[PDB]
Amino acid sequence: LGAFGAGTLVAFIGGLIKNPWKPVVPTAEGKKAVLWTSGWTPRFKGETIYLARAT
Amino acid sequence: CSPPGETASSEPGTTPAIWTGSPSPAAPSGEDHGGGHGAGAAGAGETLTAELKT
Ligand SMILES: CCCCCCCCCCCCCCCC(=O)O[C@H](COC(=O)CCCCCCC[C@@H](C)CCCCCCCCC)COP(=O)(O)O[C@H]1[C@H](O)[C@H](O)[C@H](O)[C@@H](O)[C@@H]1O
Numbered sequence: 001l002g003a004f005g006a007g008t009l010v011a012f013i014g015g016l017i018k019n020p021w022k023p024v025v026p027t028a029e030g031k032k033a034v035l036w037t038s039g040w041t042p043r044f045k046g047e048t049i050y051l052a053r054a055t
Numbered sequence: 056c057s058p059p060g061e062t063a064s065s066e067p068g069t070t071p072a073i074w075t076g077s078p079s080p081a082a083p084s085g086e087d088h089g090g091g092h093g094a095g096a097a098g099a100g101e102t103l104t105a106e107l108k109t
Contacts, residue, residue: 043082044082046076047077048076
C-alpha cells in the first residue's frame with residue numbers, strides 16, 4: 001500500500017512539477033532560465049533593443 | 056537586513072557611448088541583402104545612387 005500510494009501520488013504530481021531553472025530562454029550567453037531573462041536580455045551579443053513607447 | 060549591494064557615492068560615471076548594434080548572427084543565418092540583380096562583376100546590386108555637385 002505504501003509503495004502504491006507513493007507511485008500514484010508521484011505520478012499524479014509529476015505532471016505539474018516543472019523545473020524553474022531549466023535553461024529555456026535563449027540569450028547571448030546561451031540559454032538561461034526564465035527568471036534571469038526578461039525582454040531586455042540581448043538575444044545575441046550587441047543586439048539593439050529600443051525603448052519603444054507603447055502607443 | 057539590507058541587500059548586500061547598494062549605494063555608490065564615488066565614481067560619478069560617464070555619458071553612455073552612442074550605441075552601435077551588431078548584425079544578428081543568431082536570428083539571421085547569413086547577412087541580409089537589399090537590391091537583387093545579376094551583378095556580373097565584383098558586386099553592385101540593384102541599388103546605386105549618386106550626387107552630381109557643382
Ligand atoms: C515517496 C516518493 C519519493 C519520490 C519523490 C519524487 C520527487 C523528487 C524528484 C526526483 C527526481 C528528479 C530528477 C529526475 C526527473 C526530472 O528531471 O524532472 C524534474 C522534476 O521531477 C519530476 O519529474 C516530477 C516530480 C514527481 C512528483 C513528486 C511529488 C512529491 C512527493 C514527495 C509526494 C508524493 C510521495 C508520497 C508521500 C506522501 C504520502 C501521502 C500521505 C524537473 O523537471 P523538468 O526538467 O522541467 O521536466 C518536466 C518533467 O519532469 C515533468 O514531469 C513534466 O511535467 C514536464 O512538465 C517537464 O517540464
